[PDB]
Amino acid sequence: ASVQLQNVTKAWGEVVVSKDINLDIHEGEFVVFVGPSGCGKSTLLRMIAGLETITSGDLFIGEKRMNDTPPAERGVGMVFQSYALYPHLSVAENMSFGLKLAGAKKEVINQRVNQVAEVLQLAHLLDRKPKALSGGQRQRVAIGRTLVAEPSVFLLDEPLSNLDAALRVQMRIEISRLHKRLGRTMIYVTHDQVEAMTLADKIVVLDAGRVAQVGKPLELYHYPADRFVAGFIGSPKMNFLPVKVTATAIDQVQVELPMPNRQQVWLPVESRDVQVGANMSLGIRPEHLLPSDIADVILEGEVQVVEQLGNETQIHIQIPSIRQNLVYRQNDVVLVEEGATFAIGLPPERCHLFREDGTACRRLHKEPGVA
Amino acid sequence: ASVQLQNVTKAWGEVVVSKDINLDIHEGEFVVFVGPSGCGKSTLLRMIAGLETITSGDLFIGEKRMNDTPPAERGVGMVFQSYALYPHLSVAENMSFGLKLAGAKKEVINQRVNQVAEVLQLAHLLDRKPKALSGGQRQRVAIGRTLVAEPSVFLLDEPLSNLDAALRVQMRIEISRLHKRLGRTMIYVTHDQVEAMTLADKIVVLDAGRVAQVGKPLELYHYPADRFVAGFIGSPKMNFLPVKATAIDQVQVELPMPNRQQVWLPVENMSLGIRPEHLLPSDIADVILEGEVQVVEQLGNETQIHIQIPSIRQNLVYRQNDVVLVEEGATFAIGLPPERCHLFREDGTACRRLHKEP
Amino acid sequence: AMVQPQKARLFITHLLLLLFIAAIMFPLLMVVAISLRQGNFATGSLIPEQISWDHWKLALGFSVEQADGRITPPPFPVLLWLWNSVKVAGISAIGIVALSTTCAYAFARMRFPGKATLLKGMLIFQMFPAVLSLVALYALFDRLGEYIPFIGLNTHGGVIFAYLGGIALHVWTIKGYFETIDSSLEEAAALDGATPWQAFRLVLLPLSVPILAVVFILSFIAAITEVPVASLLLRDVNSYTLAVGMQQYLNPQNYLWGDFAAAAVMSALPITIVFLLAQRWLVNGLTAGGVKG
Amino acid sequence: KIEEGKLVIWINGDKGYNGLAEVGKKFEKDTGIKVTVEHPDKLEEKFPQVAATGDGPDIIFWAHDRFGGYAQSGLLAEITPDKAFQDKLYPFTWDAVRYNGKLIAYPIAVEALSLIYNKDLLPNPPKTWEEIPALDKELKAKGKSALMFNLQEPYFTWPLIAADGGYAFKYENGKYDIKDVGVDNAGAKAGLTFLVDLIKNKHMNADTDYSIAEAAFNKGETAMTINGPWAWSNIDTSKVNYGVTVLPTFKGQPSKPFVGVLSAGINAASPNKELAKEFLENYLLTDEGLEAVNKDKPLGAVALKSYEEELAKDPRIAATMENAQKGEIMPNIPQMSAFWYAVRTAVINAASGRQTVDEALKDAQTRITKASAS
Amino acid sequence: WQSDALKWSVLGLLGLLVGYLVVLMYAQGEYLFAITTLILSSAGLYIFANRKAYAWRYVYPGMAGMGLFVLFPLVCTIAIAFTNYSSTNQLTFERAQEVLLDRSWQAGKTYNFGLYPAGDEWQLALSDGETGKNYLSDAFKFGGEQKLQLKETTAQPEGERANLRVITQNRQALSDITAILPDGNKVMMSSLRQFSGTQPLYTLDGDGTLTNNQSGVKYRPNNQIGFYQSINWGDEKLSPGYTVTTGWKNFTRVFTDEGIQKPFLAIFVWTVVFSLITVFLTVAVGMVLACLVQWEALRGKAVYRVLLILPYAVPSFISILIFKGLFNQSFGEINMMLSALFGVKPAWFSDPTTARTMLIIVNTWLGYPYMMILCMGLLKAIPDDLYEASAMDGAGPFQNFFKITLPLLIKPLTPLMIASFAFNFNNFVLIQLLTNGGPDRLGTTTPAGYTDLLVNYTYRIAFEGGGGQDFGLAAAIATLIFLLVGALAI
Ligand SMILES: CCCCCC/C=C/CCCCCCCCCC(=O)O[C@H](COC(=O)CCCCCCCCCCCCCCC)COP(=O)(O)OC[C@@H](O)CO
Ligand SMILES: Nc1ncnc2c1ncn2[C@@H]1O[C@H](COP(=O)(O)OP(=O)(O)NP(=O)(O)O)[C@@H](O)[C@H]1O
Ligand SMILES: Nc1ncnc2c1ncn2[C@@H]1O[C@H](COP(=O)(O)OP(=O)(O)NP(=O)(O)O)[C@@H](O)[C@H]1O
Ligand SMILES: OC[C@H]1O[C@H](O[C@H]2[C@H](O)[C@@H](O)[C@@H](O)O[C@@H]2CO)[C@H](O)[C@@H](O)[C@@H]1O
Ligand SMILES: [Mg+2]
Ligand SMILES: [Mg+2]
């Protein structure tokens, strides 16, 4: 069940899709992979599975070196991103195909399929072939086929993508439970930021075949190790203002906002390898921007976009001397036009800072719920 | 081009999948179809497409009957749920395929492909076959294939499912950028709430075949017609409590909790509804609602708290901004705003909310 | 399930098929004419002036009262021959499909030293002019015959065994079809624990059913109609295939055209049946809904 | 290794094999030796392949021409009939079954082309070829036509070509001179020139094959045709009142059709040569013996004088023997392989107008003579 | 799952049969069949033995048949090309020597014999037809070689003449009796009726020479041409003649002879052109039909489907001859129809190009169902949603075919088109039956025609052309036209 990767590399001739990747997944640990579309998430899974060849490096599942083991003998099961359902067999036959190859009893097979089909709301669809199913039903068939098989390593490749919000919740809890009932290793790939946050005992960020950062869910949200990671976790994206260093203290850095007024602000952020004058990049999340009336540092501009979400309102503002729009989030339904003058408060204790090479300056303000 | 359905129905032998549905979609209107996995969104979308037969009812595109018209002549284009890419053709060749059929202009093609390949961030992959791509890369090739064709009526089936949250933002925008530049009708199936709320001029909520409600994004959010619509629009789900004297311009009910408090609600065995986002902290409100914490979900931007109230079998979901240090088992209280409450009949229909929202 | 259109396109094709059929059926309707014409004439009117049933009666076993009074019994067991043609072709085809299919699986799903050499070796070595082959085959089955008598000369076993040599093409044919089935279906199988054989039998074959029917049809036809090998190997009249047997109707100066044509028509019958039965295996979209992409 | 103390016989499927088995059943009743008669497909080709490695039948029945090939390959034993026996058969049949002036098979039946005619359309058939054009016009006026035969295959046209002096290979005194070929000489030329003339005057059609001529006669569309004894049973089903007579003469000299003598040869590898000799000589080649095979399927003309003298009571067989006696024995030399193609193609060119008579045969001869050289 | 030890019992019992059948083949004399059977089984058992040759377990059962009934005959054919195997030299040396050693000549007189029962013993009588003298022997016992002295007699023997049945039963014992006349003549049983002075024509020497008892000529084995020849060589050679390895003589002969080379290239063009056009046509005709028949809008499809493959169901031999009947120039129903409408009679057999055309119509007629049946299955592999996608890109029937259906079919169909080219290239039969290679290529020393394929023009040299049936030449050419179609498969 313990899956470990050391200096794992995958090349497609000259194109490198995974470079020197190192991970350590302990038994019963829920590890969630995230990264941009086409960065190598599935490639990592398919190497763990044994459906792709590892170019160089070692793969250890159960402390056994599995580089050259056939797929069957790996103790690994996978919900394929492309489903790969047997299109000649019913939902039932699909979900029971794994145990039919084991020496399973008919009453064992029929009992644990009717149970796992009930939690995925597939009760009624049990006789249909994949042709006679919806996209989200086929996806659920794929999830079920693996839950029935109950392997030492659960690999789940974007398994919830094609389900409604309300169901995507109901599946999340059943997977959450199964991880705590079996106590077995699950590697779970998703784009859904909420899933990444809730299900993960630990999250891995990928970036063009490179491990960007590993850590707890709150550990990445609050403390990205660089610019890329900061821009990837949390939707909407984190706003980025180009700033200049004016003064440095060991415990903090003072910077200058690019507006006409050349306002200055002290940020609780390490000054390790930061020179006065040099150009940084100030990160601040839409959630963290304050209302103007109760702030020391104010930024003002013109509203470009307003998106009414019901629960909240999202307001994109063009603030002079910055090319990019600042995205701001407000609780409740807010009545704003396009072109209205809008001002937002910027809180120094919640500002991230990144060097010219993109690396973050460790935030020294202790945020709640971080070990 | 204008598109409308009229008492439209579809059956597989005698299993009804679309029940007497009625929709008027004007030209240059962006409409999104929402519904629970397996209600009939693609089935409907495909009936317009011509890929699926229509049992009974009438389908009009550009003010002429289309029921017996072959798909290739209805003036529609589509991004399939399953991509349905051409395996023998490269990324470039898949996209440029629609044009090469309708009068190939050798230069205009290369330009329109490169333009659309740039926004979908596919430019560096144009020589690849589908097999040598990621799940999301394939999906974007499918999207491109339609947008390069510039059909009269766009049909999009969950086209942003396997995209990362960040690139998903960039695609929403570029679809709006295509919608206003063309002024062409778009029917858009999606599971994403944000995509439904931001893109749509009109949202169609589908439920096991039938049309559950049609309206504006905020209109369905504030004013849902029945039990089902409330619990579908807005994630996490709206909470429901079983309630039990009425005034002229408002309705009073009793809470099924130990204290048995009575509260008046500005509306037309009942069911009460309250969203997680609407619930307040304890000391602010008049109607206090306290229970035991069950599940705490740390989302980063917010904290989502599950509460079990005595004699209430269902968990009450509460949302509160920022990181809130609260643990399982702890006792929690939340405020219940009566003006932000929904009421639902024994059958399901909602007693129209009378409070006027922004 | 799909919405269909102008139905003049059906009308125009229905007509252009009917005319095609008539044109290609006409050479065959000429044969049925010969088998019904009295005496033995290779050429006459399509609906013969003098129609006889004697040719079809002798093929079917019935005795014939001729002009002078005497009853002619059937000279040959034409029917038995047809039964022999079926056993030999049928079993042979089962054998060809079985061999070429397993052989194909390895060329398409497995990797081993000299794969391209053998596949291109198969294609090339079968395309050799088989002119002095009969002088070689007799020598093999003559020898083989004393060690295993069941597959020697004058045995249906030997004939079937000889036909199991020509799989080269069929291997290419099934190798091909295999490759258009998505890999991830057998990967999913493998991860469910299935051995390569189980993946081959439970996942891949059921989806390759149409091409297997094709290979079976193409074998059957080849073997019903085959004359040289079978005529060389079989010696007892009651073991003859219908192809081999109807050679009796062909002589130095004349052919018994009527008897021969009747035999020629019968050999089309088992093919027609087998072809008709194979249809339930010739279905579209067997992969439908399997793989997203 | 051919099984000792029994007789395996091969004969073609259109001969009376059931009758031959009846004679072999009489042989078994007298000698104890069991006889078995087989009729395998392409036995003419099957036999050499088996007789080479010491197998095959004890006796084989095929037309004599093929035996000069087998004997060269060393597949046939040299038979030894006494003068008394040799006098029972027509002497010219013995000339057919010689290799290197040594007898290699027993003549059984005699087969050759005759002149078949409709008695109703034509009561008196012409003795001469020159009578044809005059006879045709008076028939064409009644809608019909005079003569139709297979012009495409030179076996059928050779009688006329060789009537004046044409010959395959010069038979000196028992040996075919393979250098001396006569398809070029004034005789073969005069025949073919007359043949083309019949087509030119539109009495005959240049592209008339066997199948067409046979159908024309059985339907009464033509008054007379050229065909062998095999064709008779066809005309009998049509219920046509017909006769078989001698072939017309060209320039006074008789038509010289190819003679096909059916022969029985002994396998050189047989441990039963004596048993086979006795069976052939004393059991088959008798009045009683040949009757059993002929009763099954008619042998036509036979080599045995005595049975032939009895069969001739049916005018049809007597015509067959008459023409064969006046005709040319088919050379049993391998050099005929070249002859057949070259002369077939020669008549094709002359009849179609592709080449004149003179050059078409001059070409044909150069082909035969230089194929027989290299 | 069965027993794990059950596999080694199956492997041991097969490793028994092999070894037992191998040793049993080494005895009596079957050696070539033993070297080949050991290697095949060794490979076969080793493959199924260790769990690392897994891939070869699927390929081996298939390849076994190919090696045995395809490669083996190919090898034999090549092997024969190095020899003079023919009509003239068909026998092995042992078989040709054997045949010459059975040859016998009549040296003495000829006496009709009878057999006479003398109690339990036998008595032999002879009768000289030429002098009218009779001869009679003493009472003798059967079995083994004995010599009987015959006395001139006037009397009849006391026993009653024996059956042909009794003569036949005792024929063996009879054939060893050397009867000796009073004048002192050796005479033996030549037939069941006669005793004669038959003696062998040849006698085997020792150093390996055959001397003739009648003439006195000595003959020696000439292993260059493969005959016995007089002696140092004279000018007379004896038949049969035996098969002898002649190195390259038959391969070189194709390169040697100017004459067999004049029409070569011009034919080679026609054969290639003929084959390509057929391949192109059959595939095209077969593919469209396949598409038309699986089209679900069509409502008679199941009938059309069956009727369309019928040209392949009726054996081709009779079909081809019927086509020879229809295409007749003056008669024949094709030019009957073409005379009423249009009013022209095409010269199908006479004119080279119209013949070449006829031949292609017929070849297409015979071969289209094959390609159709292939595409019938092959088409079922193209998923339906590919045509749903083309509907959304606005493609019609014709556009679907050329952009999707056809490109998807060419890749699998390719090796079935290459093979079809190889088959029709050697399509000896169709030509022979229909046109016979006609019409004439005027002025060909070795005969050729305009519709002749390369294999047709060849086997007329090797099997006709008057030189017997030279198989050694036929195998030499076959090997050459395989090397050409090999260098054509490039
Ligand atoms: C010398 C060739 C002679 C061959 C003629 C054979 C004689 C039969 C007469 C038929 C005449 C053809 C007329 C065509 C009329 C259109 C019929 C039609 O309209 O029916 C179409 C049938 O397609 C189809 O055969 C597609 C139609 C194919 C049209 C192309 C024909 C030209 C032939 C060139 C092809 C050569 C290929 C070269 C190979 C290397 C319907 O197709 P779709 O629904 O889009 O397909 C999708 C679905 O089937 C699958 O879900
Ligand atoms: N067979 C192949 N040959 C070459 N390159 C490939 C192949 N398959 C995938 N790639 C590339 O490898 C990269 C990563 O593949 P993959 O791991 O599938 O991406 P991913 O992280 O799963 N993204 P997504 O599935 O879209 O969320 C992509 O950019 C592909 O273009
Ligand atoms: N061929 C078929 N036969 C029978 N039932 C079918 C068939 N195809 C689809 N269905 C059913 O039709 C219902 C709706 O189809 P569909 O429109 O694909 O669902 P959907 O709304 O697209 N949901 P999803 O794709 O999961 O977001 C599903 O519940 C299927 O069970
Ligand atoms: O190509 C014309 C050809 O078609 C058929 O031959 C087939 C044969 O039947 C198959 O078994 C395989 O070998 O392919 C051949 C063609 O590639 C006809 O039998 C044949 O007469 C005709 O010439
Ligand atoms: Mg992926
Ligand atoms: Mg759908």
Side-chain angles (χ1 to χ4, degrees), chain B residues 225-240:
Chain B
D226 67 64
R227 181 80 187 266
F228 174 80
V229 186
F232 191 88
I233 288 297
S235 200
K237 202 184 183 182
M238 188 193 287
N239 303 277
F240 303 116

PDB file of all heavy atoms in Angstrom, chain B residues 225-240:
ATOM      1  N   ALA B 225     -39.117  27.923  -7.857  1.00  0.00           N
ATOM      2  CA  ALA B 225     -40.543  27.590  -7.955  1.00  0.00           C
ATOM      3  C   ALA B 225     -40.982  26.443  -7.045  1.00  0.00           C
ATOM      4  O   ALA B 225     -42.098  26.465  -6.523  1.00  0.00           O
ATOM      5  CB  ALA B 225     -40.935  27.303  -9.406  1.00  0.00           C
ATOM      6  N   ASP B 226     -40.119  25.443  -6.870  1.00  0.00           N
ATOM      7  CA  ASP B 226     -40.433  24.312  -5.989  1.00  0.00           C
ATOM      8  C   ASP B 226     -39.237  23.761  -5.209  1.00  0.00           C
ATOM      9  O   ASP B 226     -38.107  24.232  -5.361  1.00  0.00           O
ATOM     10  CB  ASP B 226     -41.182  23.192  -6.746  1.00  0.00           C
ATOM     11  CG  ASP B 226     -40.327  22.498  -7.799  1.00  0.00           C
ATOM     12  OD1 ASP B 226     -39.318  21.855  -7.440  1.00  0.00           O
ATOM     13  OD2 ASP B 226     -40.692  22.567  -8.991  1.00  0.00           O
ATOM     14  N   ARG B 227     -39.527  22.768  -4.367  1.00  0.00           N
ATOM     15  CA  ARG B 227     -38.559  22.075  -3.514  1.00  0.00           C
ATOM     16  C   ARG B 227     -37.259  21.712  -4.238  1.00  0.00           C
ATOM     17  O   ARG B 227     -36.160  21.970  -3.732  1.00  0.00           O
ATOM     18  CB  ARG B 227     -39.216  20.812  -2.933  1.00  0.00           C
ATOM     19  CG  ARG B 227     -38.343  19.985  -1.997  1.00  0.00           C
ATOM     20  CD  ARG B 227     -38.304  20.570  -0.592  1.00  0.00           C
ATOM     21  NE  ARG B 227     -37.337  19.877   0.259  1.00  0.00           N
ATOM     22  CZ  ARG B 227     -37.629  18.868   1.078  1.00  0.00           C
ATOM     23  NH1 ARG B 227     -38.872  18.410   1.175  1.00  0.00           N
ATOM     24  NH2 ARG B 227     -36.669  18.312   1.805  1.00  0.00           N
ATOM     25  N   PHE B 228     -37.402  21.123  -5.423  1.00  0.00           N
ATOM     26  CA  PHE B 228     -36.270  20.631  -6.197  1.00  0.00           C
ATOM     27  C   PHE B 228     -35.311  21.736  -6.635  1.00  0.00           C
ATOM     28  O   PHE B 228     -34.102  21.610  -6.443  1.00  0.00           O
ATOM     29  CB  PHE B 228     -36.754  19.826  -7.411  1.00  0.00           C
ATOM     30  CG  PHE B 228     -35.648  19.409  -8.333  1.00  0.00           C
ATOM     31  CD1 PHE B 228     -34.855  18.302  -8.036  1.00  0.00           C
ATOM     32  CD2 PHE B 228     -35.387  20.133  -9.494  1.00  0.00           C
ATOM     33  CE1 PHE B 228     -33.820  17.916  -8.884  1.00  0.00           C
ATOM     34  CE2 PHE B 228     -34.352  19.760 -10.348  1.00  0.00           C
ATOM     35  CZ  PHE B 228     -33.569  18.648 -10.044  1.00  0.00           C
ATOM     36  N   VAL B 229     -35.850  22.805  -7.218  1.00  0.00           N
ATOM     37  CA  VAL B 229     -35.032  23.898  -7.762  1.00  0.00           C
ATOM     38  C   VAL B 229     -34.127  24.532  -6.700  1.00  0.00           C
ATOM     39  O   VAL B 229     -32.964  24.843  -6.971  1.00  0.00           O
ATOM     40  CB  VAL B 229     -35.899  24.989  -8.444  1.00  0.00           C
ATOM     41  CG1 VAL B 229     -35.019  26.041  -9.122  1.00  0.00           C
ATOM     42  CG2 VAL B 229     -36.846  24.362  -9.460  1.00  0.00           C
ATOM     43  N   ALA B 230     -34.666  24.705  -5.497  1.00  0.00           N
ATOM     44  CA  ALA B 230     -33.926  25.277  -4.374  1.00  0.00           C
ATOM     45  C   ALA B 230     -32.689  24.449  -4.027  1.00  0.00           C
ATOM     46  O   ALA B 230     -31.594  24.989  -3.854  1.00  0.00           O
ATOM     47  CB  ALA B 230     -34.832  25.405  -3.165  1.00  0.00           C
ATOM     48  N   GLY B 231     -32.872  23.134  -3.941  1.00  0.00           N
ATOM     49  CA  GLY B 231     -31.797  22.222  -3.566  1.00  0.00           C
ATOM     50  C   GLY B 231     -30.840  21.885  -4.691  1.00  0.00           C
ATOM     51  O   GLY B 231     -29.878  21.145  -4.481  1.00  0.00           O
ATOM     52  N   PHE B 232     -31.104  22.413  -5.886  1.00  0.00           N
ATOM     53  CA  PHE B 232     -30.203  22.202  -7.017  1.00  0.00           C
ATOM     54  C   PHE B 232     -29.346  23.419  -7.357  1.00  0.00           C
ATOM     55  O   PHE B 232     -28.137  23.282  -7.570  1.00  0.00           O
ATOM     56  CB  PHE B 232     -30.936  21.709  -8.266  1.00  0.00           C
ATOM     57  CG  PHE B 232     -30.005  21.236  -9.343  1.00  0.00           C
ATOM     58  CD1 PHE B 232     -29.567  19.914  -9.368  1.00  0.00           C
ATOM     59  CD2 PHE B 232     -29.528  22.118 -10.305  1.00  0.00           C
ATOM     60  CE1 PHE B 232     -28.685  19.476 -10.346  1.00  0.00           C
ATOM     61  CE2 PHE B 232     -28.647  21.689 -11.289  1.00  0.00           C
ATOM     62  CZ  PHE B 232     -28.223  20.365 -11.308  1.00  0.00           C
ATOM     63  N   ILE B 233     -29.973  24.594  -7.431  1.00  0.00           N
ATOM     64  CA  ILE B 233     -29.247  25.843  -7.669  1.00  0.00           C
ATOM     65  C   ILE B 233     -28.626  26.355  -6.370  1.00  0.00           C
ATOM     66  O   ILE B 233     -29.308  26.482  -5.351  1.00  0.00           O
ATOM     67  CB  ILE B 233     -30.141  26.926  -8.329  1.00  0.00           C
ATOM     68  CG1 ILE B 233     -30.439  26.570  -9.796  1.00  0.00           C
ATOM     69  CG2 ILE B 233     -29.509  28.319  -8.222  1.00  0.00           C
ATOM     70  CD1 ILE B 233     -29.221  26.520 -10.718  1.00  0.00           C
ATOM     71  N   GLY B 234     -27.326  26.637  -6.421  1.00  0.00           N
ATOM     72  CA  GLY B 234     -26.574  27.071  -5.256  1.00  0.00           C
ATOM     73  C   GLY B 234     -25.976  25.883  -4.539  1.00  0.00           C
ATOM     74  O   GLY B 234     -26.702  25.029  -4.029  1.00  0.00           O
ATOM     75  N   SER B 235     -24.648  25.828  -4.519  1.00  0.00           N
ATOM     76  CA  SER B 235     -23.911  24.785  -3.813  1.00  0.00           C
ATOM     77  C   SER B 235     -23.035  25.430  -2.734  1.00  0.00           C
ATOM     78  O   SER B 235     -22.317  26.387  -3.024  1.00  0.00           O
ATOM     79  CB  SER B 235     -23.057  23.976  -4.791  1.00  0.00           C
ATOM     80  OG  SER B 235     -22.695  22.718  -4.246  1.00  0.00           O
ATOM     81  N   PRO B 236     -23.077  24.906  -1.490  1.00  0.00           N
ATOM     82  CA  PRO B 236     -23.765  23.700  -1.022  1.00  0.00           C
ATOM     83  C   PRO B 236     -25.285  23.816  -1.009  1.00  0.00           C
ATOM     84  O   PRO B 236     -25.837  24.912  -1.121  1.00  0.00           O
ATOM     85  CB  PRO B 236     -23.245  23.527   0.415  1.00  0.00           C
ATOM     86  CG  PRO B 236     -22.079  24.445   0.534  1.00  0.00           C
ATOM     87  CD  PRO B 236     -22.373  25.572  -0.385  1.00  0.00           C
ATOM     88  N   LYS B 237     -25.942  22.670  -0.865  1.00  0.00           N
ATOM     89  CA  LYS B 237     -27.392  22.581  -0.895  1.00  0.00           C
ATOM     90  C   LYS B 237     -28.051  23.480   0.152  1.00  0.00           C
ATOM     91  O   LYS B 237     -27.505  23.695   1.235  1.00  0.00           O
ATOM     92  CB  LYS B 237     -27.823  21.124  -0.692  1.00  0.00           C
ATOM     93  CG  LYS B 237     -29.217  20.812  -1.211  1.00  0.00           C
ATOM     94  CD  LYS B 237     -29.655  19.387  -0.901  1.00  0.00           C
ATOM     95  CE  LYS B 237     -31.026  19.105  -1.515  1.00  0.00           C
ATOM     96  NZ  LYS B 237     -31.533  17.740  -1.212  1.00  0.00           N
ATOM     97  N   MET B 238     -29.220  24.011  -0.202  1.00  0.00           N
ATOM     98  CA  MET B 238     -30.086  24.719   0.732  1.00  0.00           C
ATOM     99  C   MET B 238     -30.645  23.723   1.752  1.00  0.00           C
ATOM    100  O   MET B 238     -31.096  22.638   1.380  1.00  0.00           O
ATOM    101  CB  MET B 238     -31.227  25.396  -0.032  1.00  0.00           C
ATOM    102  CG  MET B 238     -32.107  26.325   0.804  1.00  0.00           C
ATOM    103  SD  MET B 238     -33.650  26.840  -0.001  1.00  0.00           S
ATOM    104  CE  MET B 238     -33.055  27.995  -1.234  1.00  0.00           C
ATOM    105  N   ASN B 239     -30.598  24.090   3.032  1.00  0.00           N
ATOM    106  CA  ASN B 239     -31.119  23.245   4.111  1.00  0.00           C
ATOM    107  C   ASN B 239     -32.645  23.212   4.133  1.00  0.00           C
ATOM    108  O   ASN B 239     -33.297  24.199   3.785  1.00  0.00           O
ATOM    109  CB  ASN B 239     -30.612  23.737   5.464  1.00  0.00           C
ATOM    110  CG  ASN B 239     -29.106  23.777   5.540  1.00  0.00           C
ATOM    111  OD1 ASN B 239     -28.459  22.765   5.803  1.00  0.00           O
ATOM    112  ND2 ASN B 239     -28.538  24.955   5.319  1.00  0.00           N
ATOM    113  N   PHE B 240     -33.208  22.077   4.546  1.00  0.00           N
ATOM    114  CA  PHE B 240     -34.664  21.930   4.635  1.00  0.00           C
ATOM    115  C   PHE B 240     -35.124  21.430   6.012  1.00  0.00           C
ATOM    116  O   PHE B 240     -34.580  20.458   6.546  1.00  0.00           O
ATOM    117  CB  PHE B 240     -35.203  21.024   3.516  1.00  0.00           C
ATOM    118  CG  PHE B 240     -34.860  21.491   2.117  1.00  0.00           C
ATOM    119  CD1 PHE B 240     -34.047  20.715   1.290  1.00  0.00           C
ATOM    120  CD2 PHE B 240     -35.364  22.691   1.617  1.00  0.00           C
ATOM    121  CE1 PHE B 240     -33.731  21.132  -0.007  1.00  0.00           C
ATOM    122  CE2 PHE B 240     -35.050  23.116   0.319  1.00  0.00           C
ATOM    123  CZ  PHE B 240     -34.233  22.334  -0.491  1.00  0.00           C
TER     124      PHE B 240
END
